[PDB]
Amino acid sequence: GGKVVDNVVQTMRDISTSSQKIADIISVIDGIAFQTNILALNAAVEAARAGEQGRGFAVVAGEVRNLAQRSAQAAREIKSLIEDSVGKVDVGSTLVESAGET
C-alpha cells in the first residue's frame, strides 16, 4: 500500500520531531546540572568563611557536586540513547522506503 508507506514516513517524521523535543528537555537539565555544580562551588567558598561551623555544610556541598556530575552522566546516557534512536529512525525510514520499492 503506497499510502501506508507515505503514512509510515510521516510517523517517522513525528518520532524524529519527538526525539528533538526529548533532546531539548534533557539539554535544559544538563544546564541545570551545570548551575548546580557552580552553586556547590559557591557553597564551598561560603562554608570556608564560617570555619568550624561550615564544615558540615561543606560535606553537603560536596554531595550536591556529586549529584550535579551524576545528573550530567545521566543526561549523557539519555543523549547517547537519543543518538542510537536517531540512527534507528533513519534505518526504519530507509527500510520502509525500500519496502515501497519492492
Binding site: 557552580i38 562551588l41 559557591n42 567558598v45 570556608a48 568563611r49
Partner: peptide, 8 residues
Amino acid sequence: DILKVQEI
C-alpha cells in the same frame, strides 16, 4: 586567595 573572593 579564597578570603578575598566575594561572588562568582
